[PDB]
């Protein structure tokens, strides 16, 4: 049984619009510690990890851990029924049959409530190990989101390169190829920062990245962590409540 009251309703809205297109169903991990959600995409080539700490909710109460099987698209619709300013509250009984989403409106007049039917679902879980990537880029959520979009027009694979003072996403295709160099800032609004140990040049499928970018409204800044021949970690920090990470396996390069 858990009940959470988030006055920043919209966060939830953003958090779902940021998950649905990439994964259809999933299991929410509610406990006294907070709310989490980790699932791979149907193709197992990508994986998202949500984390909402309980200290982040205006009110949070749990007396018995749960796991609600949810058809994210359905929850996506029900949240589209809450104004960006409403105070959202989630409440789920023990052997929960449904999840209750309540929307209180600012202008004390309207109050909506829904009961989303839950499902029997079994999501496979992974153990992501803490590791030190040999290149970490922190940049504007907006920019990274544009880079992936434009680049998806030239070709379908992006080649991120990273040195000590700049990073470069380039992609080739039918009409040609294109490069986009970001140079390290060095005060200002949102600057690009590279904390590189070893240089890197990876390849990733833009299709997948363009999904990750749906999470852009959750944070002004976005940070990419990368290494040799393993996954790329795209992270959006969610205010002072937690964060959201997407991991994307790389496209295998010439080693044949």
């Amino acid at each position: 049984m858990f009940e959470a009251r988030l006055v920043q309703g919209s966060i939830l809205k953003k958090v779902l619009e940021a998950l649905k297109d990439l994964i259809n169903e999933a299991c929410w991990d509610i406990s006294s510690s907070g709310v989490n959600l980790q699932s791979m995409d149907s193709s197992h080539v990508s994986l998202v990890q949500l984390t909402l700490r309980s200290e982040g909710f205006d009110t949070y109460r749990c007396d018995r851990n749960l796991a609600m099987g949810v058809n994210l698209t359905s929850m996506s619709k029900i949240l589209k029924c809450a104004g960006n300013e409403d105070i959202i509250t989630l409440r789920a009984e023990d052997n929960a049959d449904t999840l209750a989403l309540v929307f209180e409106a600012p202008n004390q007049e309207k109050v909506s409530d829904y009961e989303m039917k839950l499902m029997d679902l079994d999501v496979e879980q992974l153990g992501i190990p803490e590791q030190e990537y040999s290149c970490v880029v922190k940049m504007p959520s907006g920019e990274f989101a544009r880079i992936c979009r434009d680049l998806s027009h030239i070709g379908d694979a992006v080649v991120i390169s990273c040195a000590k003072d700049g990073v470069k996403f380039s992609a080739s295709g039918e009409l040609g190829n294109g490069n986009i160099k970001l140079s390290q800032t060095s005060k200002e609004e949102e600057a690009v920062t590279i904390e590189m140990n070893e240089p890197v040049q990876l390849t990733f499928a833009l299709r997948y990245l363009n999904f990750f970018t749906k999470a852009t409204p959750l944070s002004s800044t976005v940070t990419l962590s990368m290494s040799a021949d393993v996954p790329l970690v795209v992270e959006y920090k969610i205010a002072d409540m937690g964060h959201l990470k997407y991991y994307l396996a790389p496209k295998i390069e010439d080693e044949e």
Binding site: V45, D94, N95
Partner: protein, 313 residues
């Protein structure tokens, strides 16, 4: 190696060491000090230099560890008058046999100029390889950002241990330069150390007076005699600017093993059980087929499955 650098780091700086299962290294490219590896291979309990590299390599393969073997080049000038006068071995020109096997297995190998781990570390630094593999820790002092130990030394089966250079420096409050002197101070392969000094003291002495020369002056009461003609300045230089490969001119590529040839070489020339090689070779060509697309399945262990709680109508 570097006498005691192992435990020292274990103590004073634990955030640098980390033990991990092979499996976790999927997809990771690693440079192995073949020579050191080969000799270590010899001491088992001839044809061990082969039996070893053959299997130890397959296991690596099976977990998805693309490796490159690096062979020592011309030994840099140093005195290792380690008299002879148990199991006393001396790996000499087996290399060719090994280089041969690897070639057959489709595993790449580089021939470095001087020291192998020197070069190995060079690759790690460039980002042409995830880490350097040796039991000899002087690879770190040679600048290697990362070094995992026990990836061949299997001979029990201890867990691969990964040292992170950066953390070693942070914890200790040293800088590569300073560090090298610390190492030499501990017990280098290139020049006698200062007798009597304890690894701990060694650390202090270095963080106090940043260098070896600077330590000699501002210490020395007879109690701390210096080695005969010391070549520490000579050594320290080797660790810093060593002769290595051009990480850029490196062309790492893995080929498919050639079963026929292998059975010919192992189960033909170097009499080996065809049952054993055939089967091993099988495992190899299986992992060999590297998922042209990484599924986060390979990179991360499956912890289990979260099951949506039972519902009450």
């Amino acid at each position: 190696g570097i006498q005691g650098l192992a435990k020292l780091i274990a103590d004073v700086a634990p955030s640098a060491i980390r033990e991990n299962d092979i499996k976790s290294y999927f997809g990771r490219k690693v440079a192995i000090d073949a020579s050191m590896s080969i000799y270590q291979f010899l001491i088992a309990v001839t044809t061990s230099h082969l039996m070893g590299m053959f299997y130890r390599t397959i296991r690596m393969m099976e977990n998805g560890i693309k490796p490159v073997y690096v062979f020592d080049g011309k030994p840099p000038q140093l005195k290792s008058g380690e008299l002879a006068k148990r199991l006393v071995k001396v790996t000499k020109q087996h290399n060719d046999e090994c280089k041969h096997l690897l070639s057959l297995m489709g595993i790449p190998y580089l021939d470095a100029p001087s020291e192998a781990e020197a070069s190995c570390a060079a690759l790690v630094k460039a980002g042409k390889v995830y880490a350097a593999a040796t039991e000899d820790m002087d690879c770190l002092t040679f600048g290697s950002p990362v070094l995992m130990r026990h990836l061949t030394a299997s001979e029990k089966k201890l867990p691969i241990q990964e040292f992170h250079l950066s953390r070693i420096l942070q914890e200790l409050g040293l800088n590569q330069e300073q560090f090298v002197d610390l190492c030499i101070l501990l017990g280098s392969d290139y020049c006698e150390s200062i007798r009597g000094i304890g690894p701990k003291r060694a650390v202090d002495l270095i963080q106090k007076h940043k260098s070896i020369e600077e330590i000699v002056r501002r210490l020395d009461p007879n109690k701390y005699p210096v080695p005969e003609n010391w070549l520490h300045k000579e050594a320290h230089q080797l660790f810093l600017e060593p002769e290595v490969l051009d990480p850029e001119s490196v062309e790492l590529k893995w080929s498919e093993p050639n079963e026929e040839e292998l059975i010919k070489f192992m189960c033909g020339e170097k009499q080996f059980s065809e049952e054993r090689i055939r089967s091993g070779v099988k495992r190899l060509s299986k992992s060999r087929q590297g998922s042209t697309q990484g599924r986060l399945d390979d990179f991360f262990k499956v912890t289990g499955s979260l099951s949506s709680a039972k519902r009450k109508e």
